[PDB]
Amino acid sequence: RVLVVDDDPTCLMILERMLRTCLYEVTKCNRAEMALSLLRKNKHGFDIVISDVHMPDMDGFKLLEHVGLEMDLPVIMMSADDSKSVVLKGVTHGAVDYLIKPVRMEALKNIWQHVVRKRRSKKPRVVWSVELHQQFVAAVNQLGVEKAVPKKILELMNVPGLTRENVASHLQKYRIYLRRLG
């Protein structure tokens, strides 16, 4: 069910145990290019990726871009840095939620939400470029996350060729992360 990408072996060994008590199948990984090729394989069937921001072979935010945006997958950001700046960088790079080290056991129950929201959909992906996503999060946070509704989020981005149900399902995907901001 869950691929976990973390170069910290202790945090990896703990988080695998915690996810297993929540009854997830767990696969470990410690290189971002390794996790990418693992996800690339056909029929791999991974439901959620949890990935650290700190990654030795890739910018771990660019890893969030590859798993969150280029692939239509829920990636959950993970970091022992707490700052508001790091949390905002998760949304703005395609992550769907975040976990702060040390990982709360309670925080792990809230991630089951993101796979079930994923399972509401072999059928075609819709891929967002990183910049188009970054102005989507620009529009909703300028609009107010409560106030931001598919009509005005598209009316503020002003992207020719962007429809409202692109925005409607993108609001569906990132609602939870953007509400947690502010």
Binding site: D8, T10, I14, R17, A80, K101, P102, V103
Partner: protein, 153 residues
């Protein structure tokens, strides 16, 4: 052989574990680790703690080399300190976690003199928690070696 001796060992182990929390050496994250250890995962706390020791022994050796360089490379100093913060914060070694936070304050300022004092405090806090956790595990093995048993809910 005394049954009474195993009784003392149980109390001493009990009181010792209590003292690690009350003295601030371990925080509630360590109690979370003990709560992930059950009949099916009976050595989990020992195994996590031993891995934390191997990784952190490497990180401190690497920081001691990095800070001893003639031109300190904070691109190589900083991510070690960051891993050790999450490393120690995830097993509950609270004084180590906090000492790494102050260390990160001085890589961010690139203050090498402060970084040397920070590495000395982090080493001192790690060797403290390493002594305590190893004492904890030795006390348990002594109980088993007496023919005893730790109930482990």
């Amino acid at each position: 052989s005394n049954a009474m001796d195993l009784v003392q060992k149980q109390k001493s182990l009990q009181d010792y574990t209590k003292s690690l929390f009350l003295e601030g050496i371990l925080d509630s994250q360590f109690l979370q680790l003990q709560q992930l250890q059950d009949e099916s995962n009976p050595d989990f706390v020992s195994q996590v703690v031993t891995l934390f020791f191997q990784d952190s022994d490497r990180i401190l050796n690497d920081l001691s080399l990095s800070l001893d360089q003639q031109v300190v490379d904070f691109k190589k100093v900083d991510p070690h300190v960051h891993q050790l913060k999450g490393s120690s914060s995830s097993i509950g070694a609270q004084r180590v976690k906090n000492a790494c936070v102050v260390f990160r304050s001085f890589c961010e300022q690139q203050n090498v003199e402060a970084c040397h004092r920070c590495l000395q405090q982090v080493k001192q806090e790690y060797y403290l928690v390493k002594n305590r956790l190893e004492t904890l595990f030795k006390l348990e093995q002594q109980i088993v070696a007496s023919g005893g048993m730790i109930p482990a809910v």
